[PDB]
């Protein structure tokens, strides 16, 4: 049983990292885009400002700015997918 379990860990624990990726929850990111996230996304994509510059301008931490930008990208991707499905 131990040998079988080691073979199991060798096979499936290498696929368990990607199993969560394939089983990612389909979070309904259909809510209105927050002002801070929208400003961060506009600065990074349109104004072409570095995230350090965004943090300096908005008086926010670099990690928080990065999290807000990733959230903004996530809900914009969800909205774009919804628009493509409806068009």
């Amino acid at each position: 049983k131990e040998a079988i379990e080691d073979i199991k860990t060798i096979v499936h624990k290498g696929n368990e990292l990607g199993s969560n990726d394939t089983m990612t929850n389909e979070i309904k990111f259909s809510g209105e885009l927050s002002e801070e996230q929208a400003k961060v996304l506009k600065m990074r994509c349109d104004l072409k400002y570095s995230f350090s510059e965004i943090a300096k301008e908005l008086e926010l931490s670099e990690k928080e700015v990065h999290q807000e930008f990733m959230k903004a990208y996530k809900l914009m991707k969800a909205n774009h997918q919804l628009q493509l499905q409806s068009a």
């Binding site: 290498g14 990292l17 990607g18 969560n20 990612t24 990074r44 570095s50 995230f51 930008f69 990208y73």
Partner: protein
């Protein structure tokens, strides 16, 4: 002006430029002595920078005294008779002078005293043990010691002195990679930092911290590269319609585990090997697997990070995002296989430094 450079380190092999064997052996023995003195030094400095803080704590428990590390000539509450780094440098030089150079002492002193102040937080509460430096340590030498750097065309090697000893540098078949790097210093064009030196059983290596600059490409911040890292596919990257999968489960995890299994095989087989001549000869075969799988993992990680950076630059992806990396760190933490078979901190740090070099801004989430 901001730091327009990212620190970088290179390994340069050096042979001793002497005609006869005995002079080379004398120099090599002197340098081994330098290693031993450097390690004993590091121990002396760390002990001497531990004790005084606990004397401070003793006085504070005595009468709540506000004793602080400062020269008494410049502070009423100061106890030190000079600067702290000077105290450690003195208490090591008074004993080890005349055998090994003092620039090693200065570099080691700075390198430890800078870190210990940051570790003060962990040391007042107590979650960290005092360092016990090894014996095979690469000993440090400052830039104030490199001298007589030239290119001797007759011997086809750069010549220099590491504190009054000639040294012919062995680039070998490296006429491009680091070749125009030492010449970039003989003509005063590249900046060098406090370097180190290693010796691994006959060969001599110089770990030179050359300060290299960033590379500017044609990158678009709006274009985003979606990177994910898993143990089945080490890197999977999206860029619009372009997909790249770097690494295979067989070439990273399976070979790593094969090296581990071979090491266990030799460990098992060493019990009944030649006996009665000591533990060292029994574990001789184990000694072969010193940094085998670490080297393999480092090389594959370098290759994978280079391919990721190349793909991101070639598609002008000015912002690289690691998807769900926090959750994967969380699951890896509460596991055993994932932590001890999937180097994600090494991959993350290689990606971070190789993307901060190319201007790509890296995001984790």
């Amino acid at each position: 002006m901001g730091k327009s450079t990212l620190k970088h380190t290179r390994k340069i092999q050096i042979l001793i430029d002497l005609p006869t064997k005995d002079e080379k052996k004398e120099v090599m023995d002197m340098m081994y002595q330098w290693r031993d003195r450097c390690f004993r030094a590091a121990n002396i400095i760390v002990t001497h920078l531990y004790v005084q803080e606990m004397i401070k704590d003793f006085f504070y428990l005595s009468e709540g005294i506000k004793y602080k590390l400062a020269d008494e000539k410049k502070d009423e509450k100061g106890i030190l008779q000079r600067s702290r780094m000077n105290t450690t440098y003195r208490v090591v030089s008074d004993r080890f002078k005349g055998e090994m150079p003092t620039n090693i002492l200065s570099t080691l002193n700075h390198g430890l005293i800078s870190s210990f102040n940051k570790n003060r937080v962990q040391y007042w509460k107590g979650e960290r043990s005092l360092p016990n430096f090894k014996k095979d340590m690469a000993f440090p030498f400052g830039l104030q010691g490199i001298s007589r750097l030239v290119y001797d065309e007759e011997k086809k090697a750069f010549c220099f002195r590491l504190y009054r000893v000639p040294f012919k540098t062995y680039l070998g078949k490296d006429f491009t990679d680091k070749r125009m790097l030492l010449e970039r210093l003989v003509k005063g064009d590249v900046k060098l930092c406090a370097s180190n030196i290693q010796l691994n059983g006959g060969k001599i290596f110089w770990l030179a911290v050359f300060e290299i600059e960033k590379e500017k490409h044609s990158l678009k911040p709006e274009v985003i590269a979606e990177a994910s890292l898993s143990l089945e596919y080490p890197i999977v990257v999206k860029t619009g319609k372009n997909r790249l999968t770097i690494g295979t489960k067989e070439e990273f995890l399976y070979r790593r585990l094969a090296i581990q299994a071979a090491r266990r095989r030799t460990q098992v087989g060493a019990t009944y090997s030649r006996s009665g001549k000591g533990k060292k000869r029994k574990l001789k075969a184990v000694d072969k697997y010193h940094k085998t799988e670490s080297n393999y993992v480092a090389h594959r990680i370098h290759v994978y990070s280079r391919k990721l950076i190349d793909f991101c630059i070639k598609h002008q992806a000015g912002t690289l995002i690691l998807m769900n990396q926090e959750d994967k760190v969380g699951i890896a933490k509460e596991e055993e296989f994932v932590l001890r078979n999937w180097s994600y901190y090494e991959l993350m740090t290689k990606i971070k430094y190789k993307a901060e070099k190319a201007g790509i801004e890296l995001i984790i989430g």
